[PDB]
Amino acid sequence: AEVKGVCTEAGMYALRERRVHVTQEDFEMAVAKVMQKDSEKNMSIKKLWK
Amino acid sequence: GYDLSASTFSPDGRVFQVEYAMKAVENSSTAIGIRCKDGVVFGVEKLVLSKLYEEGSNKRLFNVDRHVGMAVAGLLADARSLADIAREEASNFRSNFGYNIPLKHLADRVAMYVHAYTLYSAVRPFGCSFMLGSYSVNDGAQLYMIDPSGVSYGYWGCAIGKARQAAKTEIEKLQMKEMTCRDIVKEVAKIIYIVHDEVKDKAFELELSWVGELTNGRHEIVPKDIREEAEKYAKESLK
Amino acid sequence: RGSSAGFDRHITIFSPEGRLYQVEYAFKAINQGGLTSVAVRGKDCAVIVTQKKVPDKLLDSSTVTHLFKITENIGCVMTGMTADSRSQVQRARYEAANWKYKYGYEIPVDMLCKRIADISQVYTQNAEMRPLGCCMILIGIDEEQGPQVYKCDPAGYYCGFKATAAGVKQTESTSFLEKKVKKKFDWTFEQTVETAITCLSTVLSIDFKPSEIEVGVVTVENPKFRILTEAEIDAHLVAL
Amino acid sequence: LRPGRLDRKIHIDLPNEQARLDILKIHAGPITKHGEIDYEAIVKLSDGFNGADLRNVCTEAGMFAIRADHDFVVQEDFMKAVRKVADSKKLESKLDYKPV
Amino acid sequence: SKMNLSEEVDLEDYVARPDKISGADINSICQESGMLAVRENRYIVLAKDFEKAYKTVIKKDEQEHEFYK
Amino acid sequence: DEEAVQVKEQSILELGSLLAKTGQAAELGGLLKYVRPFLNSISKAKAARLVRSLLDLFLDMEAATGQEVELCLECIEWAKSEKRTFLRQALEARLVSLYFDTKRYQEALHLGSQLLRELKKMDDKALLVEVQLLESKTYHALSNLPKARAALTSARTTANAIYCPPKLQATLD
Amino acid sequence: RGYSFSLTTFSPSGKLVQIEYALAAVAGGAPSVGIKAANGVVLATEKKQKSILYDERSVHKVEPITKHIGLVYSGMGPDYRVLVHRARKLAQQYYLVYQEPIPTAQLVQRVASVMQEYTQSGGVRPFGVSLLICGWNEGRPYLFQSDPSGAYFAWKATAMGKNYVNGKTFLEKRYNEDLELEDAIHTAILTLKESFEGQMTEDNIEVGICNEAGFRRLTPTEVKDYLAA
Amino acid sequence: SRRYDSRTTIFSPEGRLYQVEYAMEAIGHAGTCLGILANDGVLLAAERRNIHKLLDEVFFSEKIYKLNEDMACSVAGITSDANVLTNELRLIAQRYLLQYQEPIPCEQLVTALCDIKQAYTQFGGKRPFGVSLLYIGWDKHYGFQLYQSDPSGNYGGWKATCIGNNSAAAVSMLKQDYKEGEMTLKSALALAIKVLNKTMDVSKLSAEKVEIATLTRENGKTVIRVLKQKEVEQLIKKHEEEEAKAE
């Protein structure tokens, strides 16, 4: 799921920059966003358990 | 299952085993004790469960020491055990220090002994309340009461048993701080008759004891003649 | 959060989260009495003030007291279950006397609080007996440390303090005192009594009369623990 | 409970000594009382009570008077009423919960 | 930005506080500060009012006992 | 002589602060030379505190007296002698800033890369973001725009995961 | 009389849940740190009081055991006092017999045996406390940890308490074999700073060191001293 | 109190000691310990379960304990409980030496400890020692020996055995590739490396997760050694080469 989502996020970042091609920096930012939000969800679940 | 031992607190911080012990004390017949200027007077509503019992059977007034009295309510067997403990404490004090135990000290020692039975699951709380009274020239009249939880306080007039609340209301009107033992004995008899319920219980016998200057500081049973006068006064008052 | 496994709620054994529910209930039992106490440390004095409720005229108010004299120079105030507090007071007196007999000098307040805390800690570890549901506050003058105020609780925690409360309104009193303590000194005079009485009067909204509170003090000039008489208490009350 | 829907959480707790005295005065005003009435004793005996219990104190005092066949209430009746309601209170669990 | 907010009020001290609060909580803090101002009959909001409003609206939960930690 | 040493360290601190406020850069430098042997009479922590504080006071004002580089190198040598790697790193970053200020572009890049390697081997987020923005600034000065942009994006991603002080956030923007 | 049966019993899968929960209490405790430098050891802890009223100097967390051994904890305070008293008692018993300060390893072993006894004895629960012990014997520094279960480990650097996972991950990245006690103290303070949630002051933390001179708790003057850098 | 008692020393409906069964299941997870008996020595190979960049190296071993001049043991289970039993083993062996002025035979030492464990499972109301041990030693009665013990207090002598994690696979391999009566200390060491290599599925032999101790007789005196890093790595490299040459 994370690998699928990072691709779409990189595409959207390329869209915002307004170019028809995805970039390595776009992929880096996409991973930084998706993995961080997944970690946020995990820690939220941990707090709910607490 | 938070009320099955005295070594567990309830969620709100209550020892239910101790509370149940007090509940047992609340089913006994009332017993009152009034402090006055001269000394202390005790009174007990002894119900006659059967006509086959001898007068004076199951006496609820004890002499823990030659100058200290004791009235009890609740489980009689536990009360007698505490009276033996009080006698032991009084006797040990005299042997070690060489003079009569002060009533305040005696109440403290017995209260701590009672309190030690509300901390472990290996024993159960005493299901009885009692009151200690004494008089000495140096210390004057003194009256104390101890509950199952092990709490001891000084009182001017105390009640324990079924009709505790009604007795407390009657005791409030006596103005005992400036009265003598001779007049208080009649008042103690009057209160017991009023609180008693003739409709529910069949009959009762009034037991009286006192300690003060008139007795020279020795707790003893009230004389038969005085008891007869007090009973007649109480009956006459109940017009 | 509040998971249970076995008898963790019935004896002093760890809950799944690492909790001692029985200890927590002992804290909850301290509020059964319905009373509150306050202890404040001054520049050269220590003061303890607590409520005094006589439910009816029949009670002998003289015997109803929560202030006790552990030794000549140490006094304490207790809150919570009545019977439990008296038993702990007796133990403190014995421990203080034993210290004097063994080492040849009076027991420091911190050491006395430590000894009582150690005794309490045994109750929360062993499952045979429940923890005493009462709290103690000790005040005394140290030889080279000035006034001392200490408090020990059912668990065995015994931190020192500058101002403290205990009972039903411990939270409100703690906030009130912290605000006062923050401003300048939490009082720096023998009228530290006024700060305490005001703190107690503020939280409970009582407007005490002379026969509704008891005060005990120790001062550097007069280290002996004393219980102020109803007359002296009234004098402080009128002044404030 | 969000502070956009229920902005203020007002706490109506059990009455203090002064609150008990005021409630007792309010609910005992209309009674025909003979003799001095010392509300302070009733307040001291009515610890842990609520407004309904303080009203029931007056009601039970009036009931005691009616039983005695009197056209007025007395301090003894008030004391009996407070003791009665205090005994009745044992059947209720005294505990409060907070918005947490 | 819409209130009066006397100069003595430093919102940075309240921002720095480590309390987990929502935008509704912040709006309620401001609203209660204004309510206290109105109650005292002032058209200017003071730091005292802001402090009291924060205490009222960010009420702390029951404190965990200290024998842990 | 503990009381005398405490008085003397307080006096040097105050005198250096006053010299910094007044602007006597030569006097401040001479004072920093004078305090060279005072290292052995104060705690290592307080020796470092005094050195760092006096360096910061001197560098706060912008007199290009010409001794900035030499004095920073001397401070770095002291830090390496006393094994205070963290002090070394902070002063090395400030040295990078001074080198950029003093129109020294190509040289500073190698040491900036050295410190962006050491800090990333470590995880000092603050100095990492500061040095990353400084290297982006020097790349912009060299006119290597896409590399400067990449460096700036890395600085942003590093800053997104740390509470940037107002000063740091403002320089980032 | 006292229960004679063990309250700690094996679970179906072979775990001692009571020991597991004692570690959970330790985990939720206050953070602690210990670093073994090249020429000394340092122990540090957070001492965040609940309010201004508490006296910071009233009770110490870094308590000495002998002239060359000191220890700190993460968990319940009352249980720490019991172990500190037993540790001092054991150290003196050793000295009385052997006329030599107890080596750090020996003291840890004896203290550990005491904690083990409470996982098997009757009518007791495990010590919900983890100890860090530092020492200097035979011209060498020592750092040990001792858990509720009674097991002990030798560490070059470690942390306990809340967010100890991040504390250990932090220490691994920053540790170095040839560190100096000053750099060890600086790293120890920073490790605590990682998860502190507030401003760290000389009254909000506690530090102690051990070296050839001997173990001694740093004064608040020095603790503020180090904090400034 | 009866209500809170766990009843740790009773029988199950099918005649089973559940507390002993659970304790053995606890040992099933601990670090793997391996013992091989050779013609001219014995060896113990144990998986060093603790592995962290920050742990320091103290003492001469982590799981191998010396009990006498001619005995040693390894443990698998609760570490704290093991320390209690290792101390008792040292006391028992010295008490025998005091009584007879001769070193305790290995079999007697194992029996004495196993008697202590058996008592815990029969009476007392306490939990059993969740530990299983392997002993290696030499005596004038039976020469080199290797023994195993369980929490139940049962023991037996072995020529090669394993306890701990993946014991089933380890014993299955040892059974297949053990040449009874014709194994030297060198083939025994190689066999230990091969067994450990497959038993520890996580990663491979790094020469840091393995502790090996060997017992031999030299000049009429027993010698107990813990192999150093250089020689342990050398053994692993040789095992890697042989595995390569086979393929």
CA-based nearest distance D8→chain E, Å: 9
Binding-site annotation: residue ranges of D: 2, 5, 27, 50, 55
- Compute CA distances C21 → C130, C158, F161, whole Å: 11, 19, 39
Yes or no, beta carbons of D16 and C34 under 8 Å apart: no
B204-212: strand order across its sheet: B157-160, B31-35, B39-47, B204-212, B220-221
Yes or no, beta carbons of B169 and D83 under 8 Å apart: yes
CATH of domain G1-229: 3.60.20.10
Residue with tokens 């840091």: H208
Nearest residue of C to residue E67 by CA position? C157
Partners of C17 on chain G (C-beta within 8 Å) are: 21, 24-25, 28
Put simply, the chain C residues between 145 and 184 with a CB less than 8 A from any chain E CB are 153, 155-157, 159, 171
Yes or no, beta carbons of D3 and E57 under 8 Å apart: yes
Neighbours of F115 (CB within 10 A): 22
Partners of H2 on chain B (C-beta within 8 Å) are: none
> What residues does each domain of chain C span?
1-240
Q: Which domain holds residue H60?
A: 1-247
Neighbours of C99 (CB within 10 A): 18
Residue with tokens 């890049």: F109
Which fold does the domain B1-237 belong to in CATH?
Answer: Glutamine Phosphoribosylpyrophosphate, subunit 1, domain 1 (3.60.20)
Concatenate the DSSP letters of all residues of G140-162 into one string: -EEEEEE-TTS-EEEBSEEEEST
CA-based nearest distance H52→chain C, Å: 26
Partners of C155 on chain G (C-beta within 8 Å) are: 76, 78
Spatial CB neighbours of C75, under 8 Å, sequence gap ≥ 6: C48, C67, C68, C69, C138, C139, C140, C216, C218, C225, C227
G117's tokens: 């006894």
Yes or no, beta carbons of B119 and C130 under 8 Å apart: yes
User: Could you give the CA distance from residue E14 to residue E21 in angstroms, rounded to a whole number?
Assistant: 11
Chain centre to alpha carbon of residue C186:
18
Put simply, the chain D residues between 38 and 57 with a CB less than 8 A from any chain E CB are none
Residue A24, exposed/middle/buried by CB under 10 A (0-12, 13-18, 19+)?
exposed
CA-based radius of gyration for chain C:
18
Interface of E with D (CB under 8 A): 22, 24-25, 27-28, 31, 57, 61-62
Residue with tokens 């009495």: C33
Residue B128: its H or E element: strand B128-136
Pick the residue of D1, D2, D7 with the most E CBs within 10 A to test the interface with E by mutation. Answer: D7
Yes or no, beta carbons of H1 and B121 under 8 Å apart: yes
Residue with tokens 């159960």: B124
CA-based nearest distance H4→chain G, Å: 8
Yes or no, beta carbons of G76 and E68 under 8 Å apart: yes
Yes or no, beta carbons of F122 and G173 under 8 Å apart: yes
Q: What method did the depositors use to determine the structure?
A: cryo-EM
Partners of G10 on chain C (C-beta within 8 Å) are: none
Yes or no, beta carbons of G78 and C124 under 8 Å apart: yes
| D17 contacts chain C (CB < 8 A) | yes
Whether the CA torsion C89, C93, C98, C100 is positive or negative: it is positive
Yes or no, beta carbons of G50 and E68 under 8 Å apart: no
Nearest residue of D to residue B11 by CA position? D95
Neighbours of B14 (CB within 10 A): 18
Q: Which of G154, G127, G130, G114 has the alpha carbon at shortest distance from G61?
A: G130
Pairing verdict, β B220-221 and B61-65: unpaired
G213's tokens: 């001179």
Binding-site annotation: residue ranges of D for ADP: 55
Q: Are G21 and C16 a contacting pair, CB within 8 Å?
A: yes
Paired with B157 in beta bridges are: B34
Q: What is the DSSP letter of G7?
A: S
Say which of G4, G142, G151 has its CB closest to residue H80: G151
User: Could you give the CA distance from residue D61 to residue D63 in angstroms, rounded to a whole number?
Assistant: 5
| C5 contacts chain B (CB < 8 A) | no
> Structurally, how many domains does chain H consist of?
1
Chains in contact with B, where contact requires at least 3 CB pairs less than 8 Å apart: C, D, H
Spatial CB neighbours of F152, under 8 Å, sequence gap ≥ 6: F132, F133, F136
Yes or no, beta carbons of D83 and B172 under 8 Å apart: no
B140-146: strand order across its sheet: B61-65, B68-74, B128-136, B140-146, B152-154
> What residues does each domain of chain B span?
1-237
Chains in contact with E, where contact requires at least 3 CB pairs less than 8 Å apart: C, D, G
Pairing verdict, β C134-142 and C74-80: antiparallel
Q: Which of H179, H193, H201 has the alpha carbon at shortest distance from H233?
A: H193
Concatenate the DSSP letters of all residues of C52-93 into one string: ----STTB-TTT---EEESSSSEEEEEEE-HHHHHHHHHHHH
Partners of D76 on chain B (C-beta within 8 Å) are: 169
| F153 contacts chain A (CB < 8 A) | yes
Residue A27: its H or E element: helix A24-49
User: Could you give the CA distance from residue B156 to residue B172 in angstroms, rounded to a whole number?
Assistant: 10
For residues F26, F28, F31, F36, the Cα torsion angle rounded to the nearest 10 degrees is -100
| Domain CATH for H50 | 3.60.20.10
Q: Are F98 and F73 a contacting pair, CB within 8 Å?
A: no
Q: How many CB pairs under 8 A join B and C?
A: 94
Spatial CB neighbours of G167, under 8 Å, sequence gap ≥ 6: G31, G33, G159, G160, G161, G191, G194, G195
Q: Which of H97, H106, H92, H109 has the alpha carbon at shortest distance from H139?
A: H106
Partners of A28 on chain F (C-beta within 8 Å) are: 157
> What residues does each domain of chain G span?
1-229
User: Could you give the CA distance from residue C15 to residue C12 in angstroms, rounded to a whole number?
Assistant: 9
Class of domain C1-240: alpha beta
Chains in contact with G, where contact requires at least 3 CB pairs less than 8 Å apart: C, E, F, H
CA-based nearest distance G173→chain E, Å: 27
- Compute CA distances G5 → C126, F145, G118, G125, H5, whole Å: 12, 76, 12, 11, 7
Neighbours of F74 (CB within 10 A): 14
Residue C232 gets the label, from left (phi > 0), alpha (psi -120 to 50) or beta, of alpha
Spatial CB neighbours of B228, under 8 Å, sequence gap ≥ 6: none
H165's tokens: 């994690």
Our answer on whether A and H touch (3+ beta-carbon pairs < 8 Å) is no
Yes or no, beta carbons of H1 and B5 under 8 Å apart: yes
User: Could you give the CA distance from residue E1 to residue E27 in angstroms, rounded to a whole number?
Assistant: 12
